[PDB]
Amino acid sequence: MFVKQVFFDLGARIHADEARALVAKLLDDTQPGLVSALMNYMPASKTSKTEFPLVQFSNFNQGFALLGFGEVGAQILSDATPIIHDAMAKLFASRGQGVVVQVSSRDVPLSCEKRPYGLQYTVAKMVVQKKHEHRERLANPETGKVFLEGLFLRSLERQAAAVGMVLPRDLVVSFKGAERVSSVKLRPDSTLAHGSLRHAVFEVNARLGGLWSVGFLLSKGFGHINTDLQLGQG
Amino acid sequence: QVVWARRMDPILNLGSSEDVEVINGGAVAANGWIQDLLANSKAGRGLKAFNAHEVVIPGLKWVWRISLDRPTDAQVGLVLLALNKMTNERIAGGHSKDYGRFVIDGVSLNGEQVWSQSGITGGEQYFDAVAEAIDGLSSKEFEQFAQSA
RNA sequence: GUGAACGGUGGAGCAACACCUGAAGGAAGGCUUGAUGAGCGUGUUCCCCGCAUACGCGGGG
Secondary structure, three states: OEEEEEEEEOOOOOOHHHHHHHHHHHOOOOOHHHHHHHOOEOOOOOOEOOOOOOEEEEEEOOEEEEEEEHHHHHHHHHHHHHHHHHHHHHHHHHOOOOOOOEEEEEEEEOOEEOOOOOEEEEEOOEEOOOOHHHHHHHHOHHHHHHHHHHHHHHHHHHHHHHHOOOOOOOOOEEEEEOOEEEEEOOOOOOOOOEEEEEOEEEEEOOEEOOEEEOOEOOOOOOOEEEHHHHOOOO | OEEEEEOOOHHHHOOOOOOOOOOOOOHHHHHHHHHHHHHHHHOOOOOOOEEEEEOOOOOOOOOOOOOOOOOOHHHHHHHHHHHHOHHHOOOOOOOOOOOOOOOOOOOEEOOEEOEEOOEEOOOHHHHHHHHHHHOOOOOHHHHHHHOOO
16 A cells, blocks of 8 residues: 655754664653554553554654655554654753754555566665574575565565555565675674665566565564665666 | 756754744744644645646737727726737736747738837827827716716 | 107407616635655573474464
8 A cells, every 4th residue: 555754853863763763762751552553552561563554764964754655554653743742852951952843754555566577776774684594595595585575575465565555476585795794783792783784776577666575683673675676677 | 848846844944943043932843833844744735735737928010009099098008008008917827937039020091000119100190189088087077987876 | 659750059260569687796715746664783492372282383572
């Protein structure tokens, strides 16, 4: 269907996971249903859901951005945007002279069509490592290429099934090249880290017409980009 | 040409808190307005709309016809005095966009050209008649023209 | 074999003549196509959810 993208301009850049932790710390004392909505927690406990999370943080040059997938995620972002903006306004009016928080909002539709020619898509800061078995797959390129193939195809199928639209099942993807390999730490000052890929390029015969999220740690702000900017790039 | 005009939301382009110190309250009032705009956008008219308006392209030549039903020469002189300083006014237009500006390339008085760059040349008896009629022009005729029985 | 039997309502005639729907009246006052999405930090085994039924697979941060 359609997804929603809300940008919060603050005047200074804060990272997606840091903004996630900041709105977790700030709105915690009051309104527990709303933070249970935005961090996609279980209705009874603090543990997040194992399914596809509808609302995820993203990257903004002057602040942070929020993505609500589908009608439910769009409604959650719609009921949560003024409370988040008021919390940011009070937090940054408590200290200093005080800044003005600007907003932006977009409703990007989702579409996909199969074409008989390959198409190029570059994904920045995608997490692909979670276990030791994937590390054993990563050492050899032949058994790692098929792993990236299946990961990209399953991420596309999971997002298409989560948003509620049908995807053709004859898609042939291919993975060409990589630029860098780095690490991602969920919590600062922790020994544990997950391997991640920087500037991967992929080739799929079909075309995409919106924000598409691939890989792991999608909620934290990893492995997503707009295909609308990348088709006809400029 | 369809000419496109858009209205920007002013406080969507602040940038700094030095621009908001004249707004009473400061950042809090602009943030409340932003919250109201957000509540409008999720669901009362807003601002910064995008619109278009078809206009006639400039630089083309027009024609105007002003006919008279057996006029006195003071009336013809009145119309020519309007045509002399017609260039200060605007034809219809959007006042903000400075539309309707025009020069008069000519005035034909029953077929003969009486217009030059320095206003109207010729038709002297109409000008003397309207100069005679402007003198002695009292309010009394206007009063018993507008007076309703 | 009807107090029956028989019996044309007919002929002709102009609804027509003349009549102004008209006078007056501003589509306008205000409004950046300009952005937004394009590049920027983490270095190794820690919780929890299903299919199983543990030989392992997928997966939340």
